[PDB]
């Protein structure tokens, strides 16, 4: 009979998890500030890792990896990839990006830009989307935050029927043993209105966020296409499968990113242990080449997959540590 606490109630994912735990009748929820817990569903900001693993006779576990923010924040991600030999500046699956600070690496970004003057070579960048630096670097001084500038992929793979843009979301679970588990079910957050490569002010057809579009729901319910359909499309349209054309690259990128920061965040020989659910966002160009967009440290799930995914978390990340009285995951071996 184990105990746990909840310190982020805006978490749609772990709200489902806390519920499932209670339903087993072998887990009891405590208050926010009760330290005598076995599990902690902690907050997103300033989680007190320093106070974990100091309760005698209590094996403590937390649903967040300390230091994982370096991967799950755009400014840190670019810095991580460029400075890490494991990934390097010659990274093939990450769009070239640069860190820009308001009034740093700005004069360097121009070096690549000064060459783009060659012409006949696509030149559009994102923070929003524009074709020239002058206006790009003029609005990043108008919010006051630290923003990243990245090469916009001008020739994305476009779904038919519709001529639509789309991004892929993969959910990855890393347990206490740092086993990397890819959820077999992903989702395509697609565009409903056709992709217009002319001008990029109208960001309804370019930004494929589930919220921005809320022609919604024309093709697929909720503007969300899942792997079974998307796979069938690739077979019929492009004479290939999802596993071959895209997923091998996805599995490669996920495995490369986490293995890189493993020595920095691993809780192998620590006095407390950690697991965490990640949300990798990918992008496919017209030549079936996968690109990494970003990583989410506190991802939300698709409505259909909440039940299956959340149950999976309890199985391999919680019950693995706290046992009770075929798998929906793909283990990325290393």
């Amino acid at each position: 009979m184990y105990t746990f606490v909840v310190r982020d109630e805006n978490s749609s994912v772990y709200a489902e998890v806390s519920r499932l735990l209670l339903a087993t009748g072998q887990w009891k929820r405590l208050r926010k500030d009760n330290p005598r817990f076995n599990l902690m569903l902690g907050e997103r900001n300033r989680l007190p890792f320093g106070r974990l693993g100091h309760e005698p006779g209590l094996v403590q576990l937390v649903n967040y990896y300390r230091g994982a923010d370096k991967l799950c924040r755009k400014a840190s991600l670019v810095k991580l990839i460029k400075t890490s030999p494991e990934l390097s500046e010659s990274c093939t699956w990450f769009p070239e990006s640069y860190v820009i600070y308001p009034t740093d690496e700005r004069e360097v970004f121009l070096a690549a830009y000064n060459r783009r003057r060659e012409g006949r070579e696509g030149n559009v960048w994102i923070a929003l989307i524009s074709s020239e630096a002058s206006e790009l670097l003029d609005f990043i001084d108008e919010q006051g935050q630290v923003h990243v500038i990245q090469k916009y992929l001008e020739k994305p793979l476009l779904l038919e029927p519709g001529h639509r843009k789309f991004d892929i979301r993969s959910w990855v679970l890393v347990d206490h043993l740092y086993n990397i588990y890819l959820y077999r079910e992903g989702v395509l957050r697609t565009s409903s209105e056709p992709y217009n490569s002319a001008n990029f002010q109208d960001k309804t057809c370019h930004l494929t966020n589930h919220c921005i579009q809320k022609n919604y729901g024309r093709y697929e319910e909720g503007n969300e296409m899942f792997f079974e359909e998307f796979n069938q499309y690739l077979m019929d349209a492009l004479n290939t499968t999802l596993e071959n054309s895209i997923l091998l690259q996805i599995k490669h990128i996920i495995r490369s990113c986490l293995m890189c920061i493993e020595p920095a965040i691993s809780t192998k020989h620590l006095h407390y242990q950690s697991f965490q659910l990640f949300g990798f966002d990918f992008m496919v160009d017209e030549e079936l080449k996968v690109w990494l967009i970003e990583v989410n440290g506190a991802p939300a799930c698709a409505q259909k997959l909440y039940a299956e995914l959340c149950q999976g978390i309890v199985d391999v990340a919680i019950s693995s540590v706290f046992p009770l009285a075929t798998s929906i995951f793909i283990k990325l071996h290393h």
């Binding site: 320093g50 230091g67 920095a264 965040i265 020989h269 006095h271």
Partner: peptide
């Protein structure tokens, strides 16, 4: 550099 050998348990990595 193993926390298990430190006189005070903490994580120097962070």
């Amino acid at each position: 550099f193993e926390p298990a050998n430190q006189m005070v348990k903490c994580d120097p990595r962070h």
